């Protein structure tokens, strides 16, 4: 209820802020916090180094609500058609982020929650088996953290 939710929201604000401050010093709140931070940083690094290429490919994104799913799925299927690796996984997240930003830009905010759902499903069904065979997210942290 409202009272519980208020209490819980305050706890989560505390945890979020502490996790952030810890990360600025190279520490982590939890393994899960470490994975989130690694992915954020890898996404930044990816988008920064390949700024030209990344801007180019996302500039060719012309989404409508009716074509968003087909656009997402067709790009992700081609991305992983001949393999999964950590860099392609970072590209997958960065692509999803770009789609979400462009959606809001174009007043298609409803797509943000849908894209998040499509991404989580693809991750769980198609990427997780590779991830688990290759040392898990703990290994990603070791490599890209």
């Amino acid at each position: 209820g409202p009272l519980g939710s208020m209490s819980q929201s305050n706890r989560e604000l505390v945890v979020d802020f502490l996790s952030y401050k810890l990360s600025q010093k190279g520490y982590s709140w939890s393994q899960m916090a470490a994975v989130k931070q690694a992915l954020r940083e890898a996404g930044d690094e990816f988008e920064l180094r390949y700024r030209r290429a990344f801007s180019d490919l996302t500039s060719q994104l012309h989404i409508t609500p009716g074509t968003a799913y087909q656009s997402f799925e067709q790009v992700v299927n081609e991305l992983f058609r001949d393999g999964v690796n950590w860099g392609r996984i970072v590209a997958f997240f960065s692509f999803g982020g770009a789609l979400c930003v462009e959606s809001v830009d174009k007043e298609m905010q409803v797509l943000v929650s849908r894209i998040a759902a499509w991404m989580a499903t693809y991750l769980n069904d198609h990427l997780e088996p590779w991830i688990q065979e290759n040392g898990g997210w703990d290994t990603f942290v070791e490599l890209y953290g």
């Binding site: 490919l57 299927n77 860099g87 970072v90 590209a91 692509f95």
Partner: peptide, 18 residues
């Protein structure tokens, strides 16, 4: 297209760290 370019940079990125 978009997917091919994304793949290329994903691989470049992967080779650097992994």
């Amino acid at each position: 297209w978009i997917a091919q370019e994304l793949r290329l940079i994903g691989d470049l990125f992967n080779a650097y760290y992994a």
